[PDB]
Design a protein around this ligand. Structure first.
Ligand SMILES: O=S(=O)([C@@H]1C[C@@H]2O[C@H]1C(c1ccc(O)cc1)=C2c1ccc(O)cc1)N(CC(F)(F)F)c1ccc(O)cc1
Ligand SMILES: O=S(=O)([C@@H]1C[C@@H]2O[C@H]1C(c1ccc(O)cc1)=C2c1ccc(O)cc1)N(CC(F)(F)F)c1ccc(O)cc1
Lengths: 228, 244
């Protein structure tokens, strides 16, 4: 695959170009706040974000080398983690608030609040680490390829995914070396970034558990969206 | 404030190997075949006995006893099932297609069906054991990973705004950095290239996301027996018991 031939710079350029835009909520600012429903707005936003995520996934180097079945399985496993890391990234520069959209910026009180606090904690960790956009797009691609890989031609698929994950590792280390980090700082920061992925997994599972208590894209919906 | 951050990679590995808990046995001669009740009964009895030894292990993980009793319990509340699960996956590595719960309790996929919906988690644990076998995970790496689960799982859910809480969080991140250095040291000693070292570090830590997922699924299925704050605090304190 041409994906395994990419330099760190080509991988970063690919991922930056594939980035979805930041979407707005359908919140009409000329209309009062009590017209707007919070779960209503977020569902509508997530549904629009999912179309963008599908087209983003297809542009992640190596992803379209997989079978349609394997693509859907990785998306089924990663979609809420991908939504959540996007939210945390957008919220970084707004301490104590979650920027769901530029027109839906919420503080803790207006949140449910269990997950809010976990997302705020992740945003604070990214701010403390000074997470860079080039690092963020690498981490979001790792979530896509890693989340579903341990729950799968299948041997060849898994091998291909692990080789693309290794290329993303090389890319993260290259970015850190370019930024002037020592070898020791490079490995410490690589580990700090990847350990936050365990917290995003945890938040996604809690989020799934809360969704059921209070929308989830099916295998078939994701397959149809990939084929479209 | 402590000597934990002063350890070398070699001293850290020695500390973690020495702290390793014992392998326990399941109840001898349980009635087979299992019901859902009797299978859950056996596994609960094993996990409850393992939890005592995990607390003693936790106290010997460098830096853990530098935290407040409250922060120690918080990390254990968040990590205990992940710690039990990575232990099970480690024990099961040399038994493809089976989970070695205990030396006297070796179960294949079909026996997981006795408790709906526990075959799902069985398959995920078997997949993790296969991944560890594929990576040739070493004992020195396994003890590092188990310590990372203990320190990492609960660290992002201390939300407090005291100077002490900031200092606690900073201390945990510094111990986690020393364990990272220790993993890299082990790989460099084994003769891996810098590129191979970073790739293997990332492969090991990404499997921790899968263990978190299994732990959450496990909890979600249990709800559809969890050690209390008070039980964990009593076990940490290890106060002398009044005679029966
Ligand atoms: O986990 S939550 O359920 C959920 C997951 C996350 O938050 C909600 C959400 C969602 C997703 C799909 C969908 O169809 C409806 C919502 C997210 C989301 C994330 C990023 C993104 O770009 C778009 C959507 N949550 C907690 C919280 F703390 F407030 F976040 C919540 C939120 C509001 C609310 O009234 C009740 C709960
Ligand atoms: O396995 S379980 O998921 C469970 C969760 C996980 O494993 C068990 C658990 C635990 C939980 C509480 C406790 O007091 C004793 C053990 C953990 C564990 C993990 C690793 C380890 O080395 C030691 C203990 N299971 C039955 C099934 F068929 F096996 F699935 C079940 C358990 C509890 C429950 O409330 C409902 C269902």
């Amino acid at each position: 695959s041409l994906a395994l031939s990419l330099t760190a710079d080509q991988m970063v350029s690919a991922l930056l170009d594939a980035e979805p835009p930041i979407l707005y909520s359908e919140y009409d600012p000329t209309r009062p706040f009590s017209e707007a429903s919070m779960m209503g707005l977020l569902t509508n936003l997530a549904d629009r974000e999912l179309v963008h995520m599908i087209n983003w996934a297809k542009r992640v180097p190596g992803f379209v080398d997989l079978t349609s079945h394997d693509q859907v399985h990785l998306l089924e496993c990663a979609w809420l983690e991908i939504l959540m890391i996007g939210l945390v990234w957008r919220s970084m520069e707004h301490p104590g608030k979650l920027l769901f959209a530029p027109n839906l910026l919420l503080d803790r009180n207006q949140g449910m609040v269990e997950i809010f606090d976990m997302l705020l904690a992740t945003s604070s960790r990214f701010r403390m680490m000074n997470l860079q956009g080039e690092e963020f797009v690498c981490l979001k691609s790792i979530i896509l390829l890693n989340s579903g890989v341990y729950t799968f031609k299948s041997l060849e698929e898994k091998d291909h995914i692990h080789r693309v994950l290794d290329k993303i590792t090389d890319t993260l280390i290259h970015l850190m070396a370019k930024a002037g980090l020592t070898l020791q700082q490079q490995h410490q920061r690589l580990a700090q970034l990847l350990l936050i992925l365990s917290h995003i997994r945890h938040m996604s599972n809690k989020g799934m558990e809360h969704l059921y208590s209070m929308v989830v894209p099916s295998y078939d919906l994701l397959l149809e969206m990939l084929d479209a």
